[PDB]
Design a protein around this ligand. Sequence first.
Ligand SMILES: O=C(O)CCCCCC(=O)O
Length: 245
Amino acid sequence: ETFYSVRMRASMNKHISGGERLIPFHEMKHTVNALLEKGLSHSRGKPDFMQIQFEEVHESIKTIQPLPVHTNEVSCPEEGQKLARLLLEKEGVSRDVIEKAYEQIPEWSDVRGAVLFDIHTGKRMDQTKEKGVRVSRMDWPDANFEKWALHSHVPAHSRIKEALALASKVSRHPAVVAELCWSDDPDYITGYVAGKKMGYQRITAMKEYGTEEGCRVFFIDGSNDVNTYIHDLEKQPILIEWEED
Ligand SMILES: O=C(O)CCCCCC(=O)O
């Protein structure tokens, strides 16, 4: 009944891969191996550095539902991004703060973690630079997740499970207005915008095949210092359990 946070990072020289898991002890070997195997064979390359790490969690665990999901079919990245910018505005980010974020996204391609963007300053809020803010201690039991996929008619890919767990944890934070995300994997072009009102909005094309610039940005409207928020994001333990209605 004690849970452990289990984290993996892998890189070349370029970031490669990562994983966050939240598990009971008896699943340690299976989890550590799954994270290992995940790091070794990624399409961004085989890594020359990897770290795997576990710690007992002392905070109590909150179980939540996943964000509601809707999938937007688009014909091209440019259409995808336009729709994304529209949905961020719909969720409450001002056009002008959106534009400033997009001016910076190319420079964030190297950040190994999430970027926090303050809607009050129109500027990046966190001071982690290339490290990025790390969202952790969230997970989604597979069996529950596969039932969710079957009902939702969405493919039971672990990377959707991971992304929707992160997005659901993150959107629950009262200071987070929206998240904008697409992959750094050259072979996966689907991304999303996520928010409290629109839920998890998948957008089937957010970049071209073969490009490696991805993005993850949280738009922050809060009254607290950024370190508090960084601490919430790292420390609040979250499990996703879906229940049909
Ligand atoms: O909703 C999806 O299809 C998952 C998109 C998230 C991509 C993040 C990644 O795997 O790099």
